[PDB]
Design a protein around this ligand. Sequence first.
Ligand SMILES: *[C@@H]1O[C@H](CO)[C@@H](O[C@@H]2O[C@H](CO)[C@@H](O)[C@H](O[C@@H]3O[C@H](CO)[C@@H](O)[C@H](O)[C@@H]3O)[C@H]2NC(C)=O)[C@H](O)[C@H]1NC(C)=O
Ligand SMILES: *[C@@H]1O[C@H](CO)[C@@H](O[C@@H]2O[C@H](CO)[C@@H](O[C@@H]3O[C@H](CO)[C@@H](O)[C@H](O)[C@@H]3O)[C@H](O)[C@H]2NC(C)=O)[C@H](O)[C@H]1NC(C)=O
Ligand SMILES: *[C@@H]1O[C@H](CO)[C@@H](O[C@@H]2O[C@H](CO)[C@@H](O[C@@H]3O[C@H](CO)[C@@H](O)[C@H](O)[C@@H]3O)[C@H](O)[C@H]2NC(C)=O)[C@H](O)[C@H]1NC(C)=O
Ligand SMILES: CCCCCCCCCCCCCCCC
Ligand SMILES: CCCCCCCCCCCCCCCC
Ligand SMILES: *[C@@H]1O[C@H](CO)[C@@H](O)[C@H](O)[C@H]1NC(C)=O
Ligand SMILES: *[C@@H]1O[C@H](CO)[C@@H](O)[C@H](O)[C@H]1NC(C)=O
Ligand SMILES: *[C@@H]1O[C@H](CO)[C@@H](O)[C@H](O)[C@H]1NC(C)=O
Ligand SMILES: *[C@@H]1O[C@H](CO)[C@@H](O)[C@H](O)[C@H]1NC(C)=O
Ligand SMILES: *[C@@H]1O[C@H](CO)[C@@H](O)[C@H](O)[C@H]1NC(C)=O
Ligand SMILES: *[C@@H]1O[C@H](CO)[C@@H](O)[C@H](O)[C@H]1NC(C)=O
Ligand SMILES: *[C@@H]1O[C@H](CO)[C@@H](O)[C@H](O)[C@H]1NC(C)=O
Ligand SMILES: *[C@@H]1O[C@H](CO)[C@@H](O)[C@H](O)[C@H]1NC(C)=O
Ligand SMILES: [Ca+2]
Lengths: 930, 49, 49, 49
Amino acid sequence: SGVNQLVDIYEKYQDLYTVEPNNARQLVEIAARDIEKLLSNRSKALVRLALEAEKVQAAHQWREDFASNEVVYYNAKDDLDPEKNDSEPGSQRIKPVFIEDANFGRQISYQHAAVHIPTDIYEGSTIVLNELNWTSALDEVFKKNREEDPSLLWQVFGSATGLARYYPASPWVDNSRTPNKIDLYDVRRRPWYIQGAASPKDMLILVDVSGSVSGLTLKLIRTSVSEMLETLSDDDFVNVASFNSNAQDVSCFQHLVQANVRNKKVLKDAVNNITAKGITDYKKGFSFAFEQLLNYNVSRANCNKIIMLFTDGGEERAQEIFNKYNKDKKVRVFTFSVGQHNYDRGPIQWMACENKGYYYEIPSIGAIRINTQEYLDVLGRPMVLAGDKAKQVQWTNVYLDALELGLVITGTLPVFNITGQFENKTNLKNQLILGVMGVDVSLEDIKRLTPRFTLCPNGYYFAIDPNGYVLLHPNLQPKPIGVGIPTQEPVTLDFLDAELENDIKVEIRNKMIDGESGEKTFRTLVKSQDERYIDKGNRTYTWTPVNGTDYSLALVLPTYSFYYIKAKLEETITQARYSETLKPDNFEESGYTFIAPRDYCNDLKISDNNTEFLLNFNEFIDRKTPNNPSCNADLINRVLLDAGFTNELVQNYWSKQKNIKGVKARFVVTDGGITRVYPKEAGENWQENPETYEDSFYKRSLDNDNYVFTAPYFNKSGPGAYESGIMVSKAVEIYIQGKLLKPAVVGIKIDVNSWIENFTKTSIRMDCVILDDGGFLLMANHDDYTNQIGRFFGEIDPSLMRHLVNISVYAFNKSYDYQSVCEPGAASKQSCITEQTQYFFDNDSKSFSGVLDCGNCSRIFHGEKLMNTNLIFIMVESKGTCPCDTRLLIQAEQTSDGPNPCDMVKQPRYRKGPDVCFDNNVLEDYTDCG
Amino acid sequence: YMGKFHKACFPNSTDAEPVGDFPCGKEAPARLCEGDTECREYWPGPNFG
Amino acid sequence: ELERDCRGQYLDYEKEEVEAQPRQWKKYDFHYDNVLWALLTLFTVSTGE
Amino acid sequence: FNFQDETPTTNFDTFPAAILTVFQILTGEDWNAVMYHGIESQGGVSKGM
Ligand SMILES: *[C@@H]1O[C@H](CO)[C@@H](O[C@@H]2O[C@H](CO)[C@@H](O)[C@H](O[C@@H]3O[C@H](CO)[C@@H](O)[C@H](O)[C@@H]3O)[C@H]2NC(C)=O)[C@H](O)[C@H]1NC(C)=O
Ligand SMILES: *[C@@H]1O[C@H](CO)[C@@H](O[C@@H]2O[C@H](CO)[C@@H](O[C@@H]3O[C@H](CO)[C@@H](O)[C@H](O)[C@@H]3O)[C@H](O)[C@H]2NC(C)=O)[C@H](O)[C@H]1NC(C)=O
Ligand SMILES: *[C@@H]1O[C@H](CO)[C@@H](O[C@@H]2O[C@H](CO)[C@@H](O[C@@H]3O[C@H](CO)[C@@H](O)[C@H](O)[C@@H]3O)[C@H](O)[C@H]2NC(C)=O)[C@H](O)[C@H]1NC(C)=O
Ligand SMILES: CCCCCCCCCCCCCCCC
Ligand SMILES: CCCCCCCCCCCCCCCC
Ligand SMILES: *[C@@H]1O[C@H](CO)[C@@H](O)[C@H](O)[C@H]1NC(C)=O
Ligand SMILES: *[C@@H]1O[C@H](CO)[C@@H](O)[C@H](O)[C@H]1NC(C)=O
Ligand SMILES: *[C@@H]1O[C@H](CO)[C@@H](O)[C@H](O)[C@H]1NC(C)=O
Ligand SMILES: *[C@@H]1O[C@H](CO)[C@@H](O)[C@H](O)[C@H]1NC(C)=O
Ligand SMILES: *[C@@H]1O[C@H](CO)[C@@H](O)[C@H](O)[C@H]1NC(C)=O
Ligand SMILES: *[C@@H]1O[C@H](CO)[C@@H](O)[C@H](O)[C@H]1NC(C)=O
Ligand SMILES: *[C@@H]1O[C@H](CO)[C@@H](O)[C@H](O)[C@H]1NC(C)=O
Ligand SMILES: *[C@@H]1O[C@H](CO)[C@@H](O)[C@H](O)[C@H]1NC(C)=O
Ligand SMILES: [Ca+2]
């Protein structure tokens, strides 16, 4: 490996660089200021757009004739064919010129805004035509906003008539005109619209499962309750009750629980598993509802108490229950008359009137989608009446964009109907919002305000919600959150589920949620990137709140990562002699070179095919000088410095030797991006990621100040283990100015045969196995275990595995992965919660002996941990004995259900709800029971 | 006519509900069907059997 | 329930797979809108069919 | 007659509906559909013929 040669090369050129400190406090403050500036920019855009929308709707004249004055607009679901006959009577359609944009990845037209009209909504009626008429000023302000800030993504007006008008005109995703691709998108169900249209709820869905609802009515009621739950965010608390002469909970929840993905799934399953029987009793049901909304022992959002009554009809009004429980009229009651029937619907319409609610009818599936949007239309009356105290920017949970952009957060601001204002008129429907304006912020746009390459590959940033969900985290992947066993929700991943959970991390999470600032240095179990090992790390969390928002930023930083090497490359010739090493024509004196596909310069496009990126990198280096402001000098300076040091290692120590019997490959990986593997033959067998910061062994070998052997993968279709070898690595630990900084890792891909011969060579001076951390067989002697090399030892002989765990030399941690793809079973691949486990050295002792009490037999073993490595040798002498192979210890990413939600809502994670909410206004006109 | 209304032609081994509410036959004069389907036993029949 | 409303498209859940169908303002087959149409409708009623 | 996905209009729930259903069976038209409904209501063909 030549650790010492690379080391003293590094100290040999202290004049070629400078060591600089990572002041985590200043880093966190700077990144928090940057993120607050970005979000304030988007807030200013939203304010401009909402002001103009209100002004231009105030001065609109209603019409019923658009033949004389056509409305010209681009419909998103228009085919690209030049069809002159695809126009409605009252609307002439624009045919745009679409360019391909890098930011969006789709066809984009900056000349006008596009419009989305749901299929179930006719696109030429009077309401739609008037909206399309008065949204042209929105189009112009879209242009202005994008003109003052070229980094804006989708900025959109979500109309309350069903429309949606986003600025960069792009065709709808896949659902314009495509069989089996139906367009069910509706802007008024979207999480950002649901969020900006009202304040956090406290629902309680009373389902009327009595006898008279059997058949179609119960089908429609369960579908309607599912679609009602699908409009509740994570700031909303909901339970579902059901009454038939006796009221009970439909699920395991006994109170109002948060409406997150897991709890919503539990409630949906309970509602789907519900049956109809017995006589109705509207008093024992509303008593239960009003009692469950009077519970203040549990966590809640003390706002917008509601009761959702899913019945069909009856001759019972229950005046005295309401007069007893709802006399100040603090609780709304929305009554739904589901089904196709001829029961009396008078009391149902009266409960809504006397309790500030509204009455909806759901005669058939297809009417289900519209009425949920409509109670939410009702709930926004108190918000409208609060003129400018209700216009505040709110950011949603991380969700997957519709016009596919990846992960985005949307900032919403509601638009008020202001037709009669200061010239007071009847003001009939001036209590309803016009819509909600949203502007998207890309999560990859937030990632660029937290520069990660001046930190150790173990150091990173992460932000947090008030609910504890992560705005930004290395373990947050663009996949939906799994909710159970497989058979448009947001990506809500808690902080305690993106990492391993101690108690210190719970304290840190609670401190971050409250918006405080502090530091904390402690010892953490840091799971390796390959999700197969656990190392005993050494971390330092520093956090601040991001001012003006609900987010809180933190910076993980290892104790040795307080200093980084700043490349002092200003000679313009030294960098050239470093660069000449990188063309893929010198890969025989220098090793097979891979370069981390970093954003060295914007004119370089990163490529998954690495050698392509290497070619363009060499090309741009050939003519680099005039591109001074085009890109960052620090990244290229550091990568060239590291390439030079790596070349000096590979010639002055590796090219002088050329051959060792034991080795099969010699490699060095550096934080700059250079990962030159020497022989150029194993470089074809090399399967590590070009970006060194995502190399599992590199991150593992920095925390572990010793030799780490990575057992190859078992039963993996590819280069395998025999003709590639087994990975061996140690990290350089140079000292400059007496400071501990680790700039690279060297390593050897030891060949399996050259080890097995030496292991069985001394056998004259059979069962012997070598185990590393995580209990994986590195190599053995029986020569049939070496067939299953790298495979987990518990799969080989699980009895010894369980016993050796019982001595507690191997501790284990079982955790959950909510963002994993999953093979669907029976009652392509869906996403489930996989339950991955990892083993490691529980104790620090070196010698272990004992007797394996196999069933009706006895087995003897001795365990010795090789000094200065992560290995343990097990001398067990027993083969083919009586069968103690009852089960297996399968360390594998096992499909499972998550933690039991019925037990996790009684000790829920700490969570801070929204402060200001609007309900129960006295100017609100309740005489619209519909 | 005993038991002749029970062969409906089902999807390709998917075990789902049969397509069409009519009996079929794999023979020549009976009603053949189409679209990757197999005329196999165990369909209750027309008019709920 | 009006000719003004009955335009555009709608989602049909009849097939158990969502499909967009046109909205058509149709008239029933036997429809009484005349003394000659009422005579034919009443004849078909009297025959029992 | 509160079946899944449907509820027939020719049912015996109230007295007007029962009297109209009996009148329709007397005239002879579509008595078999009502028979199928009244057999499926008393359990499946298995147990309600
Ligand atoms: C099993 O095979 C050979 C057995 O000879 C192992 O290599 C030998 O390891 C011993 C360890 O103590 C060395 O002494 C042997 O010679 C050494 O060679 C290096 C070469 O740089 C010198 O610097 C040392 O001073 C010393 O002379 C060494 N011999 C050879 C030919 O490698 C081999 O490592 C082992 N297999 C595995 C996988 O480890
Ligand atoms: C915002 O609020 C204003 C008023 O508060 C709404 O404008 C009003 O809309 C109604 C329709 O609901 C108009 O009434 C209609 O008038 C036409 C012509 O007179 C008539 O043919 C219709 O039958 C109906 O009566 C009303 O004229 C119009 N203006 C006023 C001053 O009331 C406006 O629609 C609201 N915004 C949105 C997006 O709906
Ligand atoms: C994940 O792995 C870690 C490995 O450290 C586990 O933490 C350890 O868990 C054991 C079992 O509870 C703790 O032992 C206990 O210590 C207390 C206090 O002395 C004692 O009263 C108990 O009888 C028991 O011996 C051990 O202290 C703890 N390690 C540390 C550093 O606290 C952890 O349990 C694993 N699982 C999870 C979900 O984290
Ligand atoms: C525009 C008017 C066209 C009318 C077409 C109706 C066709 C049948 C006419 C009347 C049928 C008589 C049936 C009963 C006679 C006793
Ligand atoms: C599931 C198939 C066998 C079920 C047992 C036989 C039921 C059918 C017999 C009843 C038919 C009633 C009509 C009799 C008219 C004379
Ligand atoms: C946030 O505001 C507080 C007090 O207003 C201040 O102490 C802190 O430095 C601010 N943080 C940033 C990143 O501006
Ligand atoms: C915010 O906008 C200003 C100008 O509108 C721009 O100079 C600044 O860079 C923007 N902030 C961010 C974080 O992009
Ligand atoms: C509404 O329509 C009229 C007539 O077509 C037009 O003059 C006016 O500009 C439209 N409103 C807006 C805001 O564009
Ligand atoms: C839930 O489903 C199971 C299995 O179908 C059933 O046995 C149970 O009765 C259901 N729950 C209720 C409350 O009916
Ligand atoms: C809440 O707690 C109090 C006291 O701990 C208890 O009396 C009450 O029954 C609990 N439940 C409700 C719904 O108030
Ligand atoms: C970091 O490691 C050193 C020795 O490796 C240890 O003394 C120290 O306690 C560790 N840090 C913390 C916070 O425990
Ligand atoms: C990568 O790009 C190089 C240069 O164009 C090409 O020779 C090679 O075939 C490419 N490999 C893959 C897998 O695309
Ligand atoms: C070890 O095994 C014994 C019995 O086999 C069991 O009681 C015990 O909980 C296990 N674990 C430890 C740490 O002793
Ligand atoms: Ca009832």
